[PDB]
Symmetry: C3
Subunit: 159 residues, 3 copies
């Protein structure tokens, strides 16, 4: 049915260190049992303009029905693109809990999304005690603004 969920927002819609300090643009498109994801995060305010830490994480938790729970992402921006309705009950976009069991250690590695200077990215699925989750991690360069390159990722969905 509905193919696309995204978090597009012209204004800040993500809170990492303080309220609305970042823009998060995550887009998920479903093609059968696969979702193709792209994620772009832009640091806009505070330490995100001059990093102290050398890594940053973002967790998006969902209930067992596929609803986004309170987290760093402004929920009002998490919408079905086609209808512009909030992305409620998106079970068939959730990472498959048989393929990615809750709290299973992910294969020990990550992805280079840039070189010179190097930036790494990883996504871990269902690191959560109930429901579903995405946990994203990026490297960061201390003293510099946080704005990693876009990352692409693919996973198997719940049926």
């Amino acid at each position: 049915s509905l193919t696309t969920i995204w978090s597009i927002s012209p204004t800040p819609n993500c809170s990492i260190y303080e309220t609305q300090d970042a823009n998060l643009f995550l887009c998920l498109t479903k093609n059968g049992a696969h979702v193709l994801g792209t994620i772009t995060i832009k640091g806009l305010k505070g330490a995100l303009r001059e990093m102290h830490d050398n890594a940053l994480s973002l967790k998006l938790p969902f209930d067992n029905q596929g609803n986004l729970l309170n987290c760093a992402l402004e929920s009002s921006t998490w919408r079905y693109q086609e209808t512009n309705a909030v992305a409620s009950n998106a079970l068939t976009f959730m990472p498959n809990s048989t393929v990615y069991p809750r709290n299973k250690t992910a294969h020990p590695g990550n992805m280079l999304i840039q070189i010179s200077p190097n930036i790494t990215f990883s996504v871990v699925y269902n690191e959560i005690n109930s429901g579903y989750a995405f946990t994203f991690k990026w490297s960061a360069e201390p003293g510099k603004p946080f704005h990693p390159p876009t990352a692409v990722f693919c996973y198997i969905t719940e049926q």
Copy 2:
């Protein structure tokens, strides 16, 4: 019509060195002329728990109608996800024989799917005298269990 073929199995469904020594989870999703593939292979028994060789291949051969022929993968696990019927006559999931002519040498390279330690992966299409095929190759670390990271790949399908 049908969008997804996969080989999901809770039990071993692949025979590399001996009967049912591995689990193979290959998932193909069709979006027009492209298929998006993910493949995860887990070594479970025998030398797959303590490798001798430093590379391993898996060939999936198909007839000219898109039916899986006898091979290392348990055919009863190769199913259309949506209907849970065996994946018979999947011609429009086959690697395009104009784009990938039978027995054409593939571009001389491969993909790093892990570093520290390094693991490489490649897929070659239609290395077969009749019909269609996928030939997958992974590096392996001697003395260690075989369980490479998941690989993602994309190809153009038959019409």
Copy 3:
């Protein structure tokens, strides 16, 4: 509706240094707000068989309706795969102008599509004053034929 645009051609359909000196096979498939692209370019004549430069670009410009404008690609080969009609008015395949504003500097990096020897690839969206565009760039090895490995890329489309 229509899912696939491609430039498949048995004969040369691209003009880099001289008329019809290359074959370009670009395939775009739309899955909601994402397009999955693959691109393969083969140098066939002239300096493309023995390169002088160490990099080569290809720009595909489109009007505001999603029609291909005069460029290096033979327009008669740019077709909807499903109908075999020319790919006219393909607005919903165009790179989103909110996500990729015209003439916005792209994240400063590129992709390795081969090692030993190394080959890099990049795609920049909407580097154009009106309408839409793709600008592709590959490295090349002086003294050798131009035939880089296939590249895969994903972008967000216009609505």
